[PDB]
Amino acid sequence: KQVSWKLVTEYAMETKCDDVLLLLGMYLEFQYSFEMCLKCIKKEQPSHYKYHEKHYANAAIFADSKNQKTICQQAVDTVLAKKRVDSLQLTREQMLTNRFNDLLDRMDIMFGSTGSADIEEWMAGVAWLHCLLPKMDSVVYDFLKCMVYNIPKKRYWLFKGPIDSGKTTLAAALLELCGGKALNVNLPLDRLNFELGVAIDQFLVVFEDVKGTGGESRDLPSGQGINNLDNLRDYLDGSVKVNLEKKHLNKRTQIFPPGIVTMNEYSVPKTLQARFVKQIDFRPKDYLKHCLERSEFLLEKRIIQSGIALLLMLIWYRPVAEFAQSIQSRIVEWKERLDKEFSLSVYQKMKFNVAMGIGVLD
Amino acid sequence: KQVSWKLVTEYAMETKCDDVLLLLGMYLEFQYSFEMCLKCIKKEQPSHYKYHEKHYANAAIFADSKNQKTICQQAVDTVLAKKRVDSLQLTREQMLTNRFNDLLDRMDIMFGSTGSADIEEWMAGVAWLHCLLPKMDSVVYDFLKCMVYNIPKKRYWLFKGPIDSGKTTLAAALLELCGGKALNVNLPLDRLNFELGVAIDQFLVVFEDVKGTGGESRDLPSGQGINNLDNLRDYLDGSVKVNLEKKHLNKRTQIFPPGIVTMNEYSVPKTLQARFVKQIDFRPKDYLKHCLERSEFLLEKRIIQSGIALLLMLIWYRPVAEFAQSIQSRIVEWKERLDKEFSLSVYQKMKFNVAMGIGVLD
Amino acid sequence: KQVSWKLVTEYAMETKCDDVLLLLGMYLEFQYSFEMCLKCIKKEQPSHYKYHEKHYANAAIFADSKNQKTICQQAVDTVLAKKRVDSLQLTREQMLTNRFNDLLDRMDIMFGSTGSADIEEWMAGVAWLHCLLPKMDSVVYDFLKCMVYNIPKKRYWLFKGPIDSGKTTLAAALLELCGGKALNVNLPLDRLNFELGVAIDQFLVVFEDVKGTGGESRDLPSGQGINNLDNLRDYLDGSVKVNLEKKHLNKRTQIFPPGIVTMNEYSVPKTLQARFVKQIDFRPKDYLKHCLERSEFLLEKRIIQSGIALLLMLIWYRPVAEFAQSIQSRIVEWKERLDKEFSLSVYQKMKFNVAMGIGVLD
Amino acid sequence: KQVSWKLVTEYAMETKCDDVLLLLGMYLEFQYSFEMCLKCIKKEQPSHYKYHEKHYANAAIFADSKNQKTICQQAVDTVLAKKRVDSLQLTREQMLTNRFNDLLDRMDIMFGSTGSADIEEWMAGVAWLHCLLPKMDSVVYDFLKCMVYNIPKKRYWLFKGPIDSGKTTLAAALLELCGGKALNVNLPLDRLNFELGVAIDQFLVVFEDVKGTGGESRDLPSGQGINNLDNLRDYLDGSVKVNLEKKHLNKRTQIFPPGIVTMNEYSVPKTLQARFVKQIDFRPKDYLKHCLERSEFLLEKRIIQSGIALLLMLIWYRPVAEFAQSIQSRIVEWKERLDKEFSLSVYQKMKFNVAMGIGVLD
Amino acid sequence: KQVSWKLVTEYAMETKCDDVLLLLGMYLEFQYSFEMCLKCIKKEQPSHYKYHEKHYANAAIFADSKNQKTICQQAVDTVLAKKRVDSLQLTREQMLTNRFNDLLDRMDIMFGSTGSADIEEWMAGVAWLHCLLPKMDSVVYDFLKCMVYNIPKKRYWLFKGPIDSGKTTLAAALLELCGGKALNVNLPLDRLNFELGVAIDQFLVVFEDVKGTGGESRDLPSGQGINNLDNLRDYLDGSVKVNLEKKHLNKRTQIFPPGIVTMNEYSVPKTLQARFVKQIDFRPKDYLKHCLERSEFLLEKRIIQSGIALLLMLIWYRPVAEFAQSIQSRIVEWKERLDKEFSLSVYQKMKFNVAMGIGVLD
Amino acid sequence: MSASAQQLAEELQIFGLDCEEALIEKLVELCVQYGQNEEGMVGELIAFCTSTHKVGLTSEILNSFEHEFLSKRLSKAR
Numbered sequence A, B, C, D, E: 001k002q003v004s005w006k007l008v009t010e011y012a013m014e015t016k017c018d019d020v021l022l023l024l025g026m027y028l029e030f031q032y033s034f035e036m037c038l039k040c041i042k043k044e045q046p047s048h049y050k051y052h053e054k055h056y057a058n059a060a061i062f063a064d065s066k067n068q069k070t071i072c073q074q075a076v077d078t079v080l081a082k083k084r085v086d087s088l089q090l091t092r093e094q095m096l097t098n099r100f101n102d103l104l105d106r107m108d109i110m111f112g113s114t115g116s117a118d119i120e121e122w123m124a125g126v127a128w129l130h131c132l133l134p135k136m137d138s139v140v141y142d143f144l145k146c147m148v149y150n151i152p153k154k155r156y157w158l159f160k161g162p163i164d165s166g167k168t169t170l171a172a173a174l175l176e177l178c179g180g181k182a183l184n185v186n187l188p189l190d191r192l193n194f195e196l197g198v199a200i201d202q203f204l205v206v207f208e209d210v211k212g213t214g215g216e217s218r219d220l221p222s223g224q225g226i227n228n229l230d231n232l233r234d235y236l237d238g239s240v241k242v243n244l245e246k247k248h249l250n251k252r253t254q255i256f257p258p259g260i261v262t263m264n265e266y267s268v269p270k271t272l273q274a275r276f277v278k279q280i281d282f283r284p285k286d287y288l289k290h291c292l293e294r295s296e297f298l299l300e301k302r303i304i305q306s307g308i309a310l311l312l313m314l315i316w317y318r319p320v321a322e323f324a325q326s327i328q329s330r331i332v333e334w335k336e337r338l339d340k341e342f343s344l345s346v347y348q349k350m351k352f353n354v355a356m357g358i359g360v361l362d
Numbered sequence F: 001m002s003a004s005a006q007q008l009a010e011e012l013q014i015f016g017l018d019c020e021e022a023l024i025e026k027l028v029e030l031c032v033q034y035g036q037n038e039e040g041m042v043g044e045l046i047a048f049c050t051s052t053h054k055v056g057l058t059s060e061i062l063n064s065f066e067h068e069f070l071s072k073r074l075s076k077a078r
């Protein structure tokens, strides 16, 4: 005869839904019956068939609620509250530990019985990705720890390279591999405050294509990207607690999370370059282009730019003695599954086709 | 039954949490059981195992509350209210007195049994920091009192120096040593009002890297930093009660707190320089660079830019007759602990390696 | 059991607290016990030990209130409401009458038994202040009445003088002597509306350092100060009811209060100068500089820029036949106290040291 | 028992208080006792001693109300609602009829027993005002009707004249004589919408000193005044229902009221001048200056710029056959009072001293 | 003892009042008594004496309501809701059908017993209006249908003509003849969104005097009018559902209604002219000027720019076979009234005086 | 080129140092004979009215100033 808020909040803490309308719709699907729900039998969304029977009782009354958006609203705040806390208690290495596990959770489903993901294609992506930069997997481990160590004025990395090379492909996958959001600074420093407020309680930021006055002869349009970066020195250093705003009333005043800044061969001030760590010049390789011309599954199923892809690359090359001691037991698990499905011959055979310019899976 | 607001407000006044979502999440961890709480046994956060048994009763019902964000909201206002009052009653010297004690409280935990902080490394930072500027510790005492005396048009200090020298490293530590926030003026004078409203009830402000039209030949990008500073003459003087805005409706109309303004060799108008007190030209020293190359613990554990670091430097050099008479008894306490762990030989031996360019702890 | 709003509102009308969070914190200190309150015995804040026993009963329940910010909120509106009314009923001379009395109230405490203010130092400030401009006290009386008479296009005064001379020192003290707020126009005409809305129900305004295109050869940075002043002709005249905005929804449409405009030798349009009354060119005197070099108590305890300082100067020189007939009885009171502590010899002896360049109290 | 809203609303409709905080404070003065109220016996404000006994019963409980600002809030809306209606039902001539009567109501009090206004001084102002422009009284009647007739692209008048001449003195008095508000366009076209929304349900607008690019050689600062005027063609014509905004949510979409535009000899586009009706070039007369030099009562008591002053000038010269037939009976009333106190000799004797350059009352 | 909302909403749906404060005041006039209401006997406003007895019962209690603005608020939403629906169900021709009838409703009152409108003057306006442009009535029918047909990139008409010619006179009348609102684009593209959101659920838009860079030699001030028009290509075409915002939260995403764009001989880009349909160059005729010089009733009573005027012109010339079949019966009604009062001689006799330059009614 | 007695007279109206046109112009010479600005002259002058105890100003006390204090430290005659 009354709706339960603790249950809705519970479901929220589970799916970690930090959205209002999203959390509302998802919960409004349990006000029917899991008795004949197609989505429950077909095993489509783990956030449905795994929580319907758990919240079917409350959702039944939730439908006749006059505060459907209010109940879910408080849940969202509880979700953001959790992250608000974890960003202070758990070390930057533990935060990743949880991420790496959540990334594997999806894998245990997609690469299982209720999954439609083909491990062969994702293993092929690990090949293309390793053929993108010298010792790609090696660099990934360095970036990861670089994010963990968190060294002032020694955090952001530079993905400076021409158009179409792999920047937006890697800078994106890394975002999901570690966790966080991708911002933009091409817009005036007006809405910059309304966008920089997304890095709150995050792990890392991703600045996509920053426009600068430099490169006026290379047909490179100028903007405010490079400029804005310099107008955010402390933000790049992280030695001080910058100010952030979330929905009018201030929500945080913490240390601006590190990250990656991408660009297309624009000019970079010395006072700006001194805020970076490493500069990775992406090279527009042809064999990579011809490679995807016969490997649509990488661009279609989003593999070359998936965080799950890099995870497979971290478990394939990097030893177990490098991961968290609480996850080392899970790393070995897939080191057996991957070596079982693919040996060392079938693997390099894929990187081989990459060198040729043909399908990775040929 | 019923949820208690005075208890939540009490916990808020304790941790001095001036955040809404943060105060919410932290309190939502006491709705379980301190009987087997790992965070309570492991002694991770003093704001947890020290207040769970105290608020376990209310938090238990807090979970089934329909106003979880409302209850914590009022608490936040009570927190800001406290600071709102202290900024008028307690003298500027007493405000620091409390800060210095809170800084030592963390030390009594990290340098104790439930702490993972190594006093050796922090003592090493005091060495690197003293090798940053001539009579560093001496300057710190002057700045402190300079902030206490509060002399109109004689408050802000200038940290003008080239890229990578120690500006952002000191200007940051000082911020935590005294207390306050760090602002930025590189952004248009539009959102300037939404950022300058952070210095409310604060102690000092920190302007990180101000861009000016000057230094166009030194590859120094121009901006609005220097300009904005001049567009805030009264703000720099403090002889009048400037206007401030916090979340739409005005929250304060007080005297703009003093502080520090940093820059990278930009041109400075005479009408602006006349608003400062002392100009500290930071020198990019090599031995300091090579020093950190073998002392990662300073950059990792954040020591060279920690307020706690400067505190150790103030207790090591400066006599007890300079601190507050209500804290002089605590200053002598650590003057015995530090001299017990490190003599005068082991100390200078660290500053020695600094001169060399090797690890401070060698 | 129930909280009283009339009591909180009463306390608000007493301290005239026009702040929300401030009024909240101050009232939250009476929910303990005046039985052992240190602030009540030490006699620190007249707004504490004088009202605790008066509001101890309500504050006791105020703590367990779910609307701590709401109760105090209404009180604030009642406070602003009072000023909103007085600005229309009481003549501009009566408004000052009340101010002059409130300024003396502080004196009766600081210069009493529960005060830590030394009358000797404040009398010394009256000397330095009189050595700032020819017939300083005489000018003060003229400005006061100039504000009372309120003559259209004949209200604002000009404090045009080089850097470091006494402008910001006098323009500030006068602000407290009469009452009001100090605004700024160096910022774009965008937030100008959000700042000009402070002069609501005020008495006078203080424009600190206005930047103009003039003086480009005198190393004087140009801005929008002078320009904005001209973009506010009616605002300067006061013959029409200008529009003002306070927190989104308009709060007033009255006559813009007179005031003082300060600057540093910038160029002034004839159409702008015709909106002023008198131009006081402040001279950077050396003997004044060397004077404060041996009189830190003036800059520390804020005396040379205190409204209470000018009050002592008005009671020392100006006769009783010039003050309000309802305050003439109080003016004579201090004319006996001051002449009792300091004769005419000890007074001029202070102005003497000013001429020398040594401490006023030598 | 319970607070009455109809009573508060009634008082609001009486004083026509369109303010929230103002209406609140005024009503909070009846929660004491009219038994010994000084303001009730001294007859200071007609909005007090005339309504205290009427609202003493409700105000007594109003004090213990938890919605003091809410009750008065609704009243304000009822006030604006009245004007919102009158601006559509009553003809533009009837609206003035009510104004002229309200202006006389003040006179019946100030020029009565409970008034401190001297009719001699106000009659002197009528002399100075008539010595400001050729057939001043004659022009006033034309402007009045010009506002009544309301002829598209034939409404606004031009008060173009040098600095200090009488523009701001007349353009102000006229505003009160007819009714309305005075706006400004010197500010960017950004806040223009937040200021133009004041002419809602008004009668006429007053643009004070509009800055234009013209007159660059006459030391006349340029701005956006003239430009903004042209950017408001339809606003000046009034043949279409322009859009207006009051406090976020739109409050009106009516015909922009006519008015007067003042300036200081700036250049005026032909497309702009074609939106005016008559151009009055104010001449900076000396005898007028020397006149006020011996007639401070005009500038002090605000007479030369008072709407009540022009009213006396309309009743002195203009016949009764020109006023509304419902007010003609009241016009004759003062035509007897004025002719009783002052004949034709004493009147012209004042305009005489104006010609000389001495006090109007000599 | 309860207030009815359905009744207030009913009255709202009747008068179609889409205003909040307006609907409030109008309804607050029925809380007295229609027994002696002067406005009810004099027959002044059809929205009063026709609904007082209908809502006298509820309005009586409405006065003692604590939500006077809330009750009327919901009514307004119901009003806008109606239009929100009609703009989708009723064809663009039916929408006009209702308008034409509402325009005649006013006529049946003003040209009746309870009306003060003289049919002679309005018939004279039809003469002046027909002497404004060749086959004026003919053009009106074309525009009407042009609005009905609604042809993409073939909707807006151009009223390009010199100052004072009849543009603002016709573009205004047409607005009322069909229905809708008149916007402006001279203001920055900032508040453009807050103004373009008025065309929501409307029929047509009216852009008054658009300023362009062209015509710099013809003393024509440049602006952003012409530019903004080009910055709204899709808005002019109407082949896509543009975005609109009403009071913060979006209220509509429909097809931008057609309309008319007026200007004063400014330069027009080819890419802009291609968005129009017909260009009507208004000629500043003298005989029209001298005509109004002896026909003040047209400018006073607003006839030459009234939608009711054009209606009379549509019923006088255009046959009945052109109107809606549901209104054809009403068109013939006035075709008998007009021909009864005025023959063909008295009509052309008015257009005759127009040719002369004398009063249309001579 | 002088020192403008109007600039030195101001300092004489602050401490109530009554001096006619002839007296104020007497100090103007002190600003040209040694170069002492109006601000430093008045500062050193009143220090001479204390060493000899003289709260009055004539043409003698102002004359003995160039023979007692400034006479033993002329910087334009070495």
Ligand SMILES: [Zn+2]
Pocket (backbone or CB within 6 Å): A033, A034, A037, A039, A040, A048, A049, A052
């Ligand atoms: Zn299901």
Ligand SMILES: [Zn+2]
Pocket (backbone or CB within 6 Å): B033, B034, B037, B038, B039, B040, B041, B048, B049, B052
């Ligand atoms: Zn615990």
Ligand SMILES: [Zn+2]
Pocket (backbone or CB within 6 Å): C033, C034, C037, C039, C040, C048, C049, C052
């Ligand atoms: Zn106490």
Ligand SMILES: [Zn+2]
Pocket (backbone or CB within 6 Å): D033, D034, D037, D038, D039, D040, D048, D049, D052
């Ligand atoms: Zn009374």
Ligand SMILES: [Zn+2]
Pocket (backbone or CB within 6 Å): E033, E034, E035, E037, E039, E040, E048, E049, E052
């Ligand atoms: Zn009626």
